[PDB]
């Protein structure tokens, strides 16, 4: 008697790595970085109109 079992393939998934500036939405942003943001209580943005 000859009998056996088998694995006939193992299939996986790859996560799509999405960057934000690669999107078409990024016109509504001005993506500038605070190196310090955790240290801030009140922030105001002042500009001349």
């Amino acid at each position: 008697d000859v009998e056996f079992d088998a694995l006939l393939g193992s299939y996986c998934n790859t996560l799509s790595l999405v960057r934000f500036l690669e999107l078409g939405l990024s016109v509504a942003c001005v993506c500038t970085k605070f190196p310090e943001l955790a240290y801030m209580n009140e922030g105001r943005v002042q500009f001349e109109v």
Binding site: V2, E3, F4, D5, A6, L7, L8, G9, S10
Partner: protein, 49 residues
């Protein structure tokens, strides 16, 4: 749009030639391509990620 396609000819071959035949008779289980799956688990083990 198009009338004539390109179609492959050979079906797929999966035989227990080699070291897989031993595991089907002695162990009783047969991983799909042990001549590669057992190989790739070694360079993952030692080289990189």
């Amino acid at each position: 749009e198009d009338t004539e396609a390109d179609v492959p000819v050979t079906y797929g071959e999966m035989v227990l030639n080699g070291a897989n035949l031993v595991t089907a008779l002695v162990m009783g289980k047969a991983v799909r391509s042990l001549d590669d799956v057992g190989r790739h688990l070694l360079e993952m083990q030692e080289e990189q990620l």
